[PDB]
């Protein structure tokens with residue numbers, strides 16, 4: 116039986132019309148054009164021989180307006196102002212984007228999913244969805260020239276930009292910046308080795324996934340036994356699980372299936388020690404890349 | 419270590435501008451507007467009390483041009499002609515779509531991936547990628563009102579439309595029509611129980627995935643032993659695997675890694691009997707939802 120769950124990304128058309136190319140003569144990467152502003156990673160100012168320990172303050176002051184070349188590839192935007200906000204540049208251009216969607220800037224939290232538009236030379240090439248890992252990495256698909264690719268969610272017709280790609284880690288995962296300029300987690304936009312925090316199972320997403328199995332007729336794991344939220348979180352600390360915090364989306368799943376959150380917290384404790392040769396939605400390991408909102412939307416048709 | 423592999427869909431913007439709403443007063447579903455033509459599933463003509471055994475020939479002749487209401491939701495298109503091609507309708511409208519992309523119609527084969535734009539009331543709501551299963555189903559995410567949602571691939575700037583969604587099967591998977599009007603496999607667009615063919619591992623995609631592991635430093639399974647293509651296909655018949663057929667995309671992976679196709683065919687035979695407690699790219703079961711082209715593009719940056 117198929118769960119009806121897929122990695123679902125938002126339609127990318129609105130964000131495609133906001134992508135541009137930004138180059139300083141050394142690096143070429145992507146920028147996000149909204150109204151008269153173009154956002155892009157600041158290491159575009161960084162020469163090839165300075166990516167490991169740049170002085171961005173000295174690099175910024177060394178730049179002028181025409182130091183930045185901004186190009187629409189699917190035109191030329193004259194830069195009339197430039198500023199630095201943390202790990203991002205805020206370029207002011209003479210023409211405003213006539214296709215600027217309604218948007219906000221928002222930081223995304225661990226366990227929440229968002230859609231990414233991978234671009235190269237300002238040309239969108241593919242879209243996918245990821246969940247922010249507890250260690251503030253994402254398991255994306257990025258190559259050289261992908262920096263400036265953006266991640267976002269959508270509430271109604273409003274696009275909530277939450278991620279601009281910056282780099283890849285030694286273990287293959289990726290991280291980037293929020294549009295307030297900060298990097299997620301404790302990462303720095305410097306091409307050097309960096310400490311990486313441990314990853315953890317997103318307990319709330321594991322609960323959403325077990326609810327998806329029940330909604331598809333799969334419930335062998337559901338036992339009448341219960342684990343309280345308090346006792347589970349204490350258990351979670353000693354087993355590399357995130358601490359569980361219920362939401363209205365999870366409560367809706369509990370009402371629909373008739374299975375209380377606490378029953379599944381007990382199941383997670385038992386399934387973590389082993390599946391005992393059985394499968395859940397065609398899997399032998401716990402899944403945490405689907406959110407409660409993904410289950411409500413894709414299976415129950417509720418947004 | 420992260421493989422760098424994600425379910426990667428094409429950017430949906432070009433196809434978003436082609437979606438419309440089509441209704442006959444009973445069902446509401448989606449249509450694809452290209453030039454002066456709107457394609458949609460033919461069961462839009464079907465009353466609610468006739469979805470299990472309709473007479474589409476009698477239903478079509480019972481319709482006139484103004485029987486069909488076509489609406490753009492992101493306008494009204496006056497229908498000036500209507501025709502039936504297999505399981506699809508071919509509506510002719512007075513205005514041509516000014517955003518018609520360069521396109522072709524192409525049938526997709528088992529094991530090949532394509533991107534789907536899920537729409538409701540002509541409004542695009544999400545995009546995802548699937549592989550055509552050997553039994554001509556897809557493991558998608560579709561609810562009521564999703565029919566008319568389209569699947570496609572992209573060669574350059576040319577969009578190759580390959581799928582229009584029609585129905586869901588009893589086991590939860592989905593199937594639909596090619597744009598020549600035929601349903602994939604032996605399925606019929608009738609809301610009745612239907613025989614379902616067995617699913618199989620896509621051997622060529624399993625080989626692509628093992629190559630992705632090698633490209634990420636994971637090769638414990640690679641033994642010097644080899645299985646020939648001929649002997650593997652004979653084995654495949656008795657084990658619910660597709661018969662392997664190499665391509666240039668697979669040969670490129672063999673050259674890059676230095677591991678011959680035949681070594682991995684032997685590995686598949688051994689891994690199928692059990693992983694022996696080890697993991698490949700964080701998995702304990704064979705993966706076949708990534709194509710050789712996915713590995714070449716996402717990891718090697720080759721299209």
Ligand SMILES: *[C@@H](O)[C@H](C[C@@H]1CCNC1=O)NC(=O)[C@H](CC(C)C)NC(=O)OC[C@H]1C[C@@H]1C1CCCCC1
Nearest residue numbers: 158257258259262281282283285304305306307308
């Ligand atoms: C965009 O410019 C680019 C996107 C990267 C390249 C490959 N995959 C991606 O996602 N970003 C970078 O090249 C950054 C630039 C720095 C200044 C932020 N650098 C980077 O991503 O490093 C690649 C990691 C392999 C490197 C580190 C591993 C451990 C030893 C130190 C280097």
Ligand SMILES: *[C@@H](O)[C@H](C[C@@H]1CCNC1=O)NC(=O)[C@H](CC(C)C)NC(=O)OC[C@H]1C[C@@H]1C1CCCCC1
Nearest residue numbers: 461560561562565584585586588607608609610611
């Ligand atoms: C689009 O109109 C819609 C999309 C479906 C609905 C739910 N998920 C989907 O992908 N398509 C349908 O409703 C078709 C219409 C027929 C005329 C082609 N019917 C359908 O999808 O049936 C749903 C399967 C549960 C039904 C069968 C299971 C086994 C017993 C017979 C019915």
